[PDB]
Amino acid sequence: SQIRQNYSTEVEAAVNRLVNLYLRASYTYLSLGFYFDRDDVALEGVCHFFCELACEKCEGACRLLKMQNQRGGRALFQDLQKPSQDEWGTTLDAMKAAIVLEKSLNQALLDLHALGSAQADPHLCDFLESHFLDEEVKLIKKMGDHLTNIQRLVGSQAGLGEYLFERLTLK
Amino acid sequence: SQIRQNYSTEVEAAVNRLVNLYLRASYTYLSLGFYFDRDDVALEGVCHFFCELACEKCEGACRLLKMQNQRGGRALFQDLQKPSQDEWGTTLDAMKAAIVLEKSLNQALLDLHALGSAQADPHLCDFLESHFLDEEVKLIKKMGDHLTNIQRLVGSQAGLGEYLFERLTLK
Amino acid sequence: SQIRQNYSTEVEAAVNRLVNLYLRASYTYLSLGFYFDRDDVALEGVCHFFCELACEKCEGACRLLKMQNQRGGRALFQDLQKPSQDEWGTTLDAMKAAIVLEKSLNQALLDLHALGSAQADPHLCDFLESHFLDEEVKLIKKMGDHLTNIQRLVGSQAGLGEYLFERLTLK
Amino acid sequence: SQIRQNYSTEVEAAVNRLVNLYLRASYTYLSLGFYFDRDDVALEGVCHFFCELACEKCEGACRLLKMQNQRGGRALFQDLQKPSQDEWGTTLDAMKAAIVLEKSLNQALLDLHALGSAQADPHLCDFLESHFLDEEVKLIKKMGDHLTNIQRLVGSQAGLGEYLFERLTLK
Ligand SMILES: [Cl-]
Ligand SMILES: [Cl-]
Ligand SMILES: [Cl-]
Ligand SMILES: [Cl-]
């Protein structure tokens, strides 16, 4: 590489693995989105929430791939595993699966940051802090707020609660 | 006819029968609309949903009658049967009767398309695909989404659910 | 299904397979796009052409998934195979791989249309004609025009030709 | 100093050396700019590219000097060595000398970041990440893209290639 400088093979490979994780997350959210569009599920605000997250995760993948080429690394794509479920249950089940997925992405970001720290790669550490770590903390906080509101609404009238959350929060 | 070309007597008669079905559907929705305007029913969003569908079905009838004259067929009107009920029950009952009515219209459209295919009438087949078959699929999907949301809201507090659906979805 | 009408299990499964093909094509074009962004390839107009096609194929996947739910079918996602190459060669090599990929998508569309014809599913046949078959013919024609111009420019000065095509056609 | 806090003498001196490096780089690019303005070189887009970089490096010097005073360090200026050549050859030669110069600046930035890490100076580490390390990665990537395009255009008609790159990329 004519440009590569202070860019370890370890970080280059970890960045490719992180792109895979972000594209798998995007695929998971595409499945969640279309599940909530089923005529027998029919929660449009939940459809929109997850389709928006499919787009945001594809953006994170593309940002990583841009940075890989800016550093002189080589993008390598792997197969994208299908999402973990075909049917996603209630909005509560879906939001629980989403926060588990985002905690796994956050841990992957923190692991890559630690690798960049170990490799003395301050551009990598800046890139993640600037475009990923705060976005991920913000999203996980929003999902926790949603989980608490969804849980508050179950009580003994779960259908009513699920409708109201979709109508009055995800509108 | 100076203009008629590739237009079977079978399709001409089936088009007149379809006009009757669309005008009967329009009449059914006029009855549903005014039922939800009763002072002892009083669900304005449900009134508006069905009155809108009365207008849409009259538009479909008029589109068919325009096409009948464009092809050189002769419009023939029959008596319009009164709607199947005088009182329509709950919003759930009404939406169930609506989806049954729309499935019957869709089947009539598919039967006419099959006749046009059998008669090698590609203008007829184009006309239905372009102005009816996707509109009908879209409407039946919307009605299924509404049925699922209405059913979710019954639980043990049916009046509350019926109010909320009218206020928060059909607004 | 409360809504499903005239929608075969055969078409439902073929639509899921077509979604997989479109998402694999989108992934292939994401790889092509980022290959042309490498500092040792550096053809921005070729980057933009393929990244645009990644977006267009994701749109086709999403249109199919929307239609699957409008018909009352169930979206089912499979693993997404990685693209067929890690490195894509010259713009000529890349455009040849793209036209092969688009001919394979077109054949899949034609196969699904034939299935819908065999199943007497005119909504499916309309949907494909309206949103896919002409878009695919148009794209394959554009790729053929590009292949001819790329081939005209090789002569004995291939680097010069590859630069000029990127600067003067894909600008 | 009434203001100085957590600011090592080692970082203060390294910042003065980095200012010298940035002003020497600015001087080098002023020479490159005016070389491409010679009547017997006459490549205006190459003139503009290097004169723009002379301005950008002077901006980096001024940013460093501002930060030195914000931290309570004392700016110290040294003689500015003349650029390494009087005549810069072809656009390829010039772009090769530029990427070598920028790799040397990047290494100086990384060395200063490592010093700030060793001295536990997070303001310094933030300052460099925020205003220098990504700008430098971006510039080196652009220069690599240019080198690849310049090299593609040499073939057996070097004058033609050099003209075309200036006209169609550096316009
Ligand atoms: Cl799997
Ligand atoms: Cl009667
Ligand atoms: Cl594979
Ligand atoms: Cl000297």
Curated annotation (Swiss-Prot), chains A, B, C, D:
UniProt keyword Metal-binding present: yes
Residues involved in Fe cation binding: 52, 55-56, 59, 62
Region span, Catalytic site for iron oxidation: 52-59
Domain Ferritin-like diiron: 5-154
InterPro entries for the chain: Ferritin, Ferritin-like, Ferritin-like_diiron, Ferritin-like_SF, Ferritin_CS, Ferritin_DPS_dom
Coiled-coil annotated spans: none
Ranges annotated as spanning the membrane: none
GO biological process, one term: intracellular iron ion homeostasis
Compartments where located: Cytoplasmic vesicle, Autophagosome; Cytoplasm; Autolysosome
One Pfam short name: Ferritin
CC terms in the record's Gene Ontology section: autolysosome; autophagosome; cytoplasm; cytoplasmic vesicle; ferritin complex
Source superkingdom: Eukaryota
Keywords: Acetylation, Cytoplasm, Cytoplasmic vesicle, Iron, Iron storage, Lysosome, Metal-binding
GO terms, molecular function: ferric iron binding; ferrous iron binding; iron ion binding
Subunit-level organization: Oligomer of 24 subunits. There are two types of subunits: L (light) chain and H (heavy) chain. The major chain can be light or heavy, depending on the species and tissue type. The functional molecule forms a roughly spherical shell with a diameter of 12 nm and contains a central cavity into which the insoluble mineral iron core is deposited. Interacts with NCOA4.
Function: Stores iron in a soluble, non-toxic, readily available form. Important for iron homeostasis. Iron is taken up in the ferrous form and deposited as ferric hydroxides after oxidation. Also plays a role in delivery of iron to cells. Mediates iron uptake in capsule cells of the developing kidney. Delivery to lysosomes by the cargo receptor NCOA4 for autophagic degradation and release or iron.
Family membership: Belongs to the ferritin family.
Other facts: In horse spleen the light chain is the major chain.
Record's protein name: Ferritin light chain
Lineage of source species: Eukaryota, Metazoa, Chordata, Craniata, Vertebrata
Gene name as annotated: FTL
